[PDB]
Design an enzyme around this catalytic site. Structure first.
Site, short mmCIF file in Angstrom:
data_model
loop_
_atom_site.label_atom_id
_atom_site.label_comp_id
_atom_site.label_asym_id
_atom_site.label_seq_id
_atom_site.Cartn_x
_atom_site.Cartn_y
_atom_site.Cartn_z
N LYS A 14 -3.35 -6.01 -2.19
CA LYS A 14 -3.87 -6.40 -0.41
C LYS A 14 -5.20 -7.07 -1.10
O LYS A 14 -6.50 -7.11 -1.91
CB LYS A 14 -3.83 -4.93 0.16
CG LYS A 14 -2.56 -5.06 1.07
CD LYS A 14 -3.19 -3.77 1.48
CE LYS A 14 -3.76 -3.95 3.41
NZ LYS A 14 -5.10 -3.93 3.11
N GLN A 49 3.52 1.47 0.49
CA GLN A 49 3.63 1.29 1.06
C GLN A 49 3.91 0.13 2.25
O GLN A 49 4.62 -0.92 0.56
CB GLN A 49 1.86 1.41 0.96
CG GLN A 49 1.27 1.83 1.84
CD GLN A 49 0.80 3.34 1.45
OE1 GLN A 49 1.47 3.83 1.47
NE2 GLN A 49 -0.25 3.49 1.79
N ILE A 50 3.99 -0.70 2.85
CA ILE A 50 4.56 -1.29 3.70
C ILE A 50 3.32 -2.48 4.01
O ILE A 50 2.56 -1.97 4.59
CB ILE A 50 5.59 -1.16 4.46
CG1 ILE A 50 5.54 -0.59 5.77
CG2 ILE A 50 6.87 -0.97 3.79
CD1 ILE A 50 6.57 -0.23 6.73
N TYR A 51 4.02 -3.80 3.54
CA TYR A 51 2.15 -4.50 5.01
C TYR A 51 3.04 -5.98 5.24
O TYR A 51 4.31 -6.51 4.79
CB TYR A 51 1.07 -4.66 3.68
CG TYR A 51 0.48 -3.51 3.40
CD1 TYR A 51 -0.28 -2.91 3.76
CD2 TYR A 51 0.53 -3.31 1.71
CE1 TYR A 51 -1.33 -1.93 3.35
CE2 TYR A 51 0.17 -2.54 1.41
CZ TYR A 51 -0.97 -1.16 1.88
OH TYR A 51 -1.08 -0.53 1.36
#
Lengths: 60, 60, 60, 60
Positions: A14, A49-51
């Site tokens: 990220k 986790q999704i982003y």
């Protein structure tokens, strides 16, 4: 895909805010996030986790 | 996919425990969850949750 | 708490982006989110999402 | 709390399945999870996941 920013197996992180880093394991698309990725953490195996694409950067 | 249980756009719900219902918007695969789906809630547009195939059922 | 914006049981919703609405069921604090809340959706019993205070508004 | 299994700052990990490890940063309670905790990963600062008490163990 003939168009995606990243591919399965890409190592990404990220760019800012809460951290996350690991490999691309999937993908999703909604009106709100027309290009999204699922990412399995390399520190915590099994946790995904999704982003949105914008939040991620490939690690060179 | 020439093999997946569900397809994009399938309407599904969680079989038990915490509820979730909406459309399939994506997919993921890890050693822990070799067949997983992303699902956008039909009650809360834009919110997506990821789950293993086993947790979901198509809504007939 | 002698200081919190919301209390357990407050009915709130997300102000923008992905939707979410339901009751406050908890709380969290990190350096990144020094005031955060857990919210159980009123449409999907049992499903809880966590958000920073800034993202939420009480429903009047 | 005069009764909780863990306290803020406790270092814990998930017992099985997807991994997660870090410090307790919060708490939540629903009918489905009457005793739940928010945990900020020690590997990915800022990222918090919520889990039921049963899923966690303090790290000795």
């Amino acid at each position: 895909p003939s168009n995606a920013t990243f591919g399965m197996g890409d190592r990404v992180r990220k760019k800012s805010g809460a951290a996350w880093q690991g490999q691309i394991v999937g993908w999703y698309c909604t009106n709100l996030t027309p290009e999204g990725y699922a990412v399995e953490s390399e520190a915590h195996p099994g946790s995904v986790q999704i982003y949105p694409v914008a939040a991620l950067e490939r690690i060179n």
